[PDB]
Amino acid sequence: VPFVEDWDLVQTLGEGAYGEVQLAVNRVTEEAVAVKIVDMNIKKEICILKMLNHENVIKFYGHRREGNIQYLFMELASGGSLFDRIEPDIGMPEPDAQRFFHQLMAGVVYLHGIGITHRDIKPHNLLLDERDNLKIADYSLATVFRYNNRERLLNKMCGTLPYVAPELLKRREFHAEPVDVWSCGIVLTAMLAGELPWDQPSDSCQEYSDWKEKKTYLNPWKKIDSAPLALLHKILVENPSARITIPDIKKDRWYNKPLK
Numbered sequence: 001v002p003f004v005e006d007w008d009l010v011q012t013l014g015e016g017a018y019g020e021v022q023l024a025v026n027r028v029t030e031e032a033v034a035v036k037i038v039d040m041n042i043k044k045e046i047c048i049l050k051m052l053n054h055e056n057v058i059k060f061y062g063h064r065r066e067g068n069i070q071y072l073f074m075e076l077a078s079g080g081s082l083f084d085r086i087e088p089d090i091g092m093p094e095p096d097a098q099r100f101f102h103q104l105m106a107g108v109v110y111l112h113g114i115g116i117t118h119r120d121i122k123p124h125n126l127l128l129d130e131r132d133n134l135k136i137a138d139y140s141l142a143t144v145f146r147y148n149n150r151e152r153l154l155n156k157m158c159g160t161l162p163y164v165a166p167e168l169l170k171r172r173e174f175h176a177e178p179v180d181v182w183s184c185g186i187v188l189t190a191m192l193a194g195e196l197p198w199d200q201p202s203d204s205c206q207e208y209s210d211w212k213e214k215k216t217y218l219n220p221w222k223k224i225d226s227a228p229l230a231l232l233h234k235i236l237v238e239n240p241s242a243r244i245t246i247p248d249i250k251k252d253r254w255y256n257k258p259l260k
């Protein structure tokens with residue numbers, strides 16, 4: 001079994017493009033963490049990770065270089081991902097969706113407030129701790145959009161097509177924050193309907209045209225109660241300057257609705 005200084009690498013938690021994530025257990029102390037193994041722009045990622053200090057963001061513990069392999073030591077989320085709590089075609093109980101949405105907003109407000117954009121919010125990147133607390137994970141596409149109190153526009157296209165905002169397909173440069181707000185709306189849809197609304201938010205996508213023409217008698221919208229659906233009408237707005245901001249999400253009727 002492989003090992004790094006005092007830690008054993010006991011099991012795989014993620015095996016993707018950007019290396020593997022392992023469960024690491026300190027042989028002496030029994031402390032369990034997560035370790036990302038990169039087989040060597042990760043200087044950027046580490047710099048962003050060291051900024052992160054919030055209950056709804058995965059904490060960074062530190063790193064070790066050993067030849068051409070870096071080890072990123074991060075808070076373990078033993079509960080798996082939001083992806084695993086979504087029943088296909090069903091979603092999850094509205095009160096659980098609302099609580100996860102509250103936590104996702106707390107995390108995103110935090111990141112925006114230190115001028116960080118995640119750029120790939122989706123259920124695989126939203127991990128759960130042992131008490132089902134949501135943690136925003138995977139900062140490999142994250143970037144700075146505000147420095148010295150000056151906003152910079154993004155122009156790199158990235159993320160995951162079903163989750164990306166339409167401006168990212170249509171504009172040369174765009175604001176970072178409304179792109180993360182949009183992806184949070186697609187996550188809320190997935191939680192309440194167990195179904196993604198469209199392959200991509202382009203005029204060539206029939207399901208996306210249906211939404212802009214307000215055909216909410218179709219799936220996934222006909223599975224969603226009128227209150228959360230009124231919030232999705234304010235989030236999934238094609239013009240990013242008319243899209244609801246997080247301050248205004250926090251004033252929404254469903255957002256503030258007491259639930260089971």
Ligand SMILES: Nc1ncnc2n[nH]cc12
Pocket residue numbers: 013014021034058074075076077078127137138
């Ligand atoms: N993929 C992952 N699984 C569990 N905990 C983690 N923390 N950072 C990434 C993780």
Ligand SMILES: [Cl-]
Pocket residue numbers: 086190194195196
């Ligand atoms: Cl889904």
